[PDB]
Amino acid sequence: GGSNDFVYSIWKGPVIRAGNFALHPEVVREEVKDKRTLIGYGRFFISNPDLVDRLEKGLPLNKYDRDTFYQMSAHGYIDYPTYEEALKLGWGSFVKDFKPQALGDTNLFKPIKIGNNELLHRAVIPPLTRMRALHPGNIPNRDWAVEYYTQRAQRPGTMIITEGAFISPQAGGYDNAPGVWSEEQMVEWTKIFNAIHEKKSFVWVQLWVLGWAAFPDNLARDGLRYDSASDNVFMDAEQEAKAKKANNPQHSLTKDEIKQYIKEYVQAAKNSIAAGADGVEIHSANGYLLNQFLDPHSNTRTDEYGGSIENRARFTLEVVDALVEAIGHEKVGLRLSPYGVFNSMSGGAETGIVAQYAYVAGELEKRAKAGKRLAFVHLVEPR
Template sequence: MSKLFTEVTLGQIKLKNKVVMAPMTRSRSIGNIPGDLVAEYYEQRSEAGLIITEGTSPSPNGLGYARIPGIFSKEQIAGWKKVTDRVHAKGSKIFIQLMHTGRIGHPANLPLGGVILAPSAVLAKGQMWTDKEGMKDHPTPKEMTTAEILAARDEYVQASKNAIEAGFDGVELHAANGYLMEQFLHPSSNKRTDEYGGSIEKRIKFVTDTAAAVASAIGKDKVGIRLSPYGAFNDLGPHEDTHEEYGLLAEKLNEIGIVYIHLVDHSSMGAPKVEPATVKKIREAFKRTLILSGGYDRARAEADLDSGAADLIAFGKPFLSNPDLVTKLEKGLPLAPVDQTTLYTPDAKGYTDYPVTQHSVPVV
């Protein structure tokens, strides 16, 4: 019997299946406010038991990319309320991913007064798109003061409270893919010699302090985290402490009692494969829900659920072009390909215009 399509409990909420829609940036939030188009997009994909939204900034300083949403203003809370209402009406649950981009940004994408901040003033290689000036090099970030670190932690806490006000079932802290939280974890981007840098124990402090503060504010059953050990995005890659660091981080997160760890393996996109020993160490250290993601099809998902390697399976790109992915997986229907040219464009094309298979029946 298939486990992928059966109900499961996550913390205190019931999910109608074990399929998770992974967070994926889509750059459709004009003025950094999610509008009706964003609400339609998530509603279309509400066959998933759990939706995790695209990265959403807890701070004006974290809006590094063009047209990504935030959740620090009343207008943003109101916009997200439309999303959660429509998703809940279809029987799905939804967590918001809180993503502060840190050094991965450009002033042209930030609102007035925004600052590119990072643990240390270490330049990230590469460029990013700005609507105002086209492709631009990343600037060297400003090294955060202790006061700015504490302020950033508090921004995550307030954003989490805002998320609950907007109707979200919980929040996912984005500590992966080279953004602010992972910048603290990584020795190449964190050169600090104070309580937030140097040893493994000090490098994980911002992440664990923030996770504990958010759990205290909204409840530990409403807090998850995404990690990408051995990832290679945004000028960060595996380092000699990766295995030990993520093992210790998993232990500390287990002590805090958050509801899930979402572990992503980007080897299907060319990154180094996550070492099985590290996954095993995290699985053994963290006693609550483990979500695995990265290049899954139905067969691999079923195998990892059957073996106990994972409790939930997240699918990314297939959800972009297949709003009815759960039905297609269950019925063995062919999947539509993704239009790569419209991933980050500002309108409905390649976003809400992918068709639903006529044989599909909504899974509620």
């Protein structure tokens, strides 16, 4: 329990903050007074393709339908209306008791350069897993994905971060999330990136590795390991049961296996940039594999990759450095969730949690002062 504000005392570059901001313009108005703060809006970008217009002008917001967040359907994906469309449908309904503020007069609508991209405003689409990829193959949805991203790219100069995308088969384990390792995948991503660019917006691929959050039975079917930092602490009882039934026990990664993941991160980043992406974001949050190394609950290792703040941060920072070298610091961002407890991370109950994340922020600032500043740090807010 606590605040992410500590990061601003350490890292001096752009910071994207996400969590419960759409219904709190009064909070946003204060936050964007800081000249390097951007705001990610998740659930309300799902439900409002023209969210940026509505934020600028202080318009009512479309309610979101959580039941279709992960359903294999166009409904709840590409059929939420723009405000003028909604008025034609007689919707004038919208979110209840919400008092909108026109935020057009604030830094939210001031231009900012992120990486190589000239953003025209600071409302960012954060990564949103929608589970509409095709199985087998983890292929971006050929029916609706281009339309979905095109709708949400509609305001010129919008930064879009894609839903988490698996860097390899071993990195995955959900059948209906997309990957970025194969040619059939990249054929569809190219179409998505083209459409976003045709709308004068920008796109960054979130690179995803599941670790203990993967489904051990899916991995077992595909001849893959069930991976984490350690082999003596498990995500939850269901996952423990699944691993036992699939005869696929959680496996503590060897140093060579870590190296192989780094190789796959580099290849996935290269694939993304080749297909037209503006950059990549490393998912080191929400209790996935990198987070499993950062967190002392999940990381009980006694080698170079656990047992101290520096050791726990080593995998995340190795991935950062490998990507910076491969594609350039201006095309790399990093996502963190210091207070998260999702997927059995520790959050603020771990007294050393701020130190762990302060260390990572400090190492990023150190690299920046030496000439290699990441495009951004993206923080999950405990809101």
